């Protein structure tokens, strides 16, 4: 059982599962937690509960703490704002309080939606200006984390995909049914520019970063990472089709801005020099990662996924 200890919040979720695992299988003692339904694999915690959080930090004494749990769906934020702010910003705070009060290295996972996408590619120290509320809540997190912990690291990250359990876990993986039903025609956004990023890559950067900070206390502040294949939500759908040897034709590419899309940033691309400099980072090809991530939701496989023959 390794010496270094790492806490991974939101480990029930897509991104946290990968970080927990990358850290663990590269010789760390790694503890995951989440309210959602942590048990039996993880520890159960309500991040809004001060003591629940305080307890498992002061009983675990972690040197690195990665913070993935948050309200991520941009729509749900504008539906329930009282809560989204409470979890993205406040929890982040309390976590950052308890983090530096245990001498621990907080890595707050953030988001490209803190930018407006009017002048890409965006660098670490460029001027944030979100267009939507999720955009702003991930940003207010960054404050609440830095104001309560000099030497915590913010790590901004684009749209995520990866080895999901339910297609809704990623805005990439959802389109899948729309790609397999070659009979039904389906529209796809061709306006907004994206950079899909595999969470197992993100988890790699997350560990890579943390370890250097175990030697070098200058590792801190804000960082960008991102996969560098640039695609629309439509272009994704056709690489997914092609990756699985499927027709992408029933896919109509709509090129107009969505009717909510003056409040969704066009190309909020990240410049990953800051990290690339320190030689951090993994970039699994989309064409591969997405095929690794989706074959369990192939219909023919999906049919045979019962409990008994």
């Amino acid at each position: 059982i390794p010496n270094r200890r790492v806490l991974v919040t939101g480990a029930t979720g897509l991104l946290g599962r990968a970080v927990h695992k990358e850290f663990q299988q590269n010789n760390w003692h790694a503890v995951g937690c989440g309210f959602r339904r942590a048990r039996p694999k993880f520890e159960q915690v309500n991040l809004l509960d001060s003591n629940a959080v305080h307890h498992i930090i002061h009983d675990f004494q972690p040197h690195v703490i990665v913070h993935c749990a948050a309200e991520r769906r941009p729509d749900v934020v504008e539906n329930q704002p009282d809560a989204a702010s409470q979890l993205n910003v406040d929890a982040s705070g309390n976590l950052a309080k308890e983090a530096a009060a245990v001498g621990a290295f907080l890595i707050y996972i953030s988001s490209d939606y803190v930018f407006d996408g009017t002048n890409p590619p965006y660098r670490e120290e460029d001027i944030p200006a979100p267009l939507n509320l999720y955009g702003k809540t991930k940003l207010d997190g960054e404050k609440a984390v830095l104001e309560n912990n000099l030497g915590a690291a913010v790590l901004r990250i684009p749209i995520l995909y990866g080895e999901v359990e339910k297609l809704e876990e990623s805005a990439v993986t959802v389109m899948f049914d729309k790609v397999q039903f070659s009979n039904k025609s389906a529209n796809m956004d061709h306006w907004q520019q994206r950079f899909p990023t595999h969470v197992k890559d993100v988890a790699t950067v997350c560990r890579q970063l943390a370890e250097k900070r175990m030697l070098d206390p200058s590792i801190k502040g804000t960082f960008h990472w991102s996969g560098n294949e640039q695609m629309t939500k439509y272009e994704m759908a056709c690489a997914i089709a092609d990756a699985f040897n499927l027709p992408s034709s029933h896919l109509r590419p709509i090129t107009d801005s969505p009717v909510l899309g003056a409040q969704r940033p066009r190309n909020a691309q990240l410049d990953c020099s800051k990290l690339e400099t320190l030689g951090i980072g993994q970039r699994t090809p989309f064409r591969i990662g997405i095929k690794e991530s989706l074959w369990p939701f192939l219909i023919d496989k999906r049919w045979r996924q019962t409990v008994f023959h």
Binding site: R39, P40, E165, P296, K301, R304, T306, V307, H309
Partner: protein
């Protein structure tokens, strides 16, 4: 949200049906220490004060059926009137004919070992699942370890009011995951067990929960809502063969996968490799385990079938429960390219002439340490 309960039960060394599986297998071992090529279909029957052997053995061994049978019963632990059965004084009856000559000249006589035909027809299955290290389904696994623990502590001294006869049922609450299953929590546990007259329920129940269950079932699956039913309907010394009947080969779901996957009716115990009911059922398990471990599927169901006198099996079929990225045809084609499931070959791969079968006759034949069939094969493809 698509989540289910499942239950597997297990019985312990001195449950009548499992004394017969044990004794029968003990008679198999007797013959194999002397004549490794023994033909054995020993079936045991156990009622009040009786052990009857019935069947067909053909072997150059010379075997003291009285000694063998009673040493098995002794080992199991019945040794006084008070306990309900006694090795020193039980009746032992031996009705053991030779192997039908028609079967021998249809199966193995005049044939090279490798080219031996199936010892009879039928279907076998092989199951495997990623839900546990041991690669078995958690229900049956826990079920067995509870009965194993009871013995350990009866035998090692640390709870010497115990007796051989026991029955554990483990209910688990599950979740589906892209074809695989996920043990979430233990819903219910039950432990009937035989004891002597000088203990109170409240002291046994306390012991069962803290010395056995708590030290077998990982804390992570237990919670404050997990039901325990320790000594369910009270006192229990009417146990073992007393007021009973017991037959070899009646606890086959328990011997195998606890009700998961599938079974083709094959009683294992009291049989040698030539009887595919057993050898191919191990081969099947080896196959499927080697595919889960190998890393191709996450859980898989295998089926072989043979016909009497025919080495190359008549059917082979894989069901990977939607869990592999490869097709089922692709896995089948691997299995053919890596295994060879004639009995004359399997005997060699899984070393099935060794007198160690009696181990198997309790606590399940699968998911267990040191068995040949449980050591996955590295696969070329």
């Amino acid at each position: 949200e698509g989540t289910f309960l499942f239950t597997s039960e297990s019985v312990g060394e001195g449950h009548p049906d499992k004394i017969c599986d044990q004794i029968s297998d003990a008679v198999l071992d007797a013959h194999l220490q002397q004549d490794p090529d023994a033909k054995v279909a020993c079936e045991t029957v156990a009622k009040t004060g009786m052990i009857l052997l019935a069947g067909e053995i053909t072997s150059r061994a010379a075997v003291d059926y009285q000694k063998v049978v009673r040493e098995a019963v002794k080992h199991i632990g019945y040794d006084d009137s008070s306990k309900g059965f006694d090795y020193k004084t039980c009746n032992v009856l031996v009705a053991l004919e030779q192997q039908s000559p028609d079967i021998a000249q249809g199966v193995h006589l005049d044939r090279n070992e490798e080219d031996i035909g199936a010892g009879d027809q039928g279907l076998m299955f092989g199951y495997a699942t990623d839900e546990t290290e041991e690669c078995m389904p958690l229900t049956i696994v826990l079920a067995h370890k509870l009965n194993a623990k009871l013995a350990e502590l009866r035998r090692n001294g640390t709870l010497p009011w115990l007796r051989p006869d026991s029955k554990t049922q483990v209910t688990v609450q599950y979740m589906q995951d892209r074809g695989a299953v996920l043990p979430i929590r233990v819903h219910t546990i039950v432990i009937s067990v035989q004891h002597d007259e000088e203990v109170c329920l409240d002291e046994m129940r306390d012991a069962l929960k803290e010395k056995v269950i708590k030290a077998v079932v990982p804390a992570k699956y237990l919670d404050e809502d997990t039901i325990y039913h320790l000594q369910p309907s009270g006192r229990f010394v009417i146990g073992g063969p007393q007021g009973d009947a017991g037959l070899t080969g009646r606890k086959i779901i328990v011997d195998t996968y606890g009700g998961w996957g599938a079974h083709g009716g094959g009683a294992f115990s009291g049989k040698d490799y030539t009887k595919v009911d057993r050898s191919a059922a191990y081969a099947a398990r080896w196959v499927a385990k080697s595919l889960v471990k190998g890393g191709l599927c996450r859980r898989v169901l295998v089926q072989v079938s043979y016909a009497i006198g025919v080495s190359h099996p008549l059917s082979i079929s894989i069901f990977h429960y939607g869990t592999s990225q490869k097709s089922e045809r692709e896995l089948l084609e691997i299995v053919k390219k890596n295994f060879d499931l004639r009995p004359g070959v399997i005997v060699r791969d899984l070393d099935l002439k060794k007198p160690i079968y009696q181990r198997t006759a309790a606590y399940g034949h699968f998911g267990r340490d040191s068995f040949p069939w449980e050591v996955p094969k590295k696969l070329k493809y």
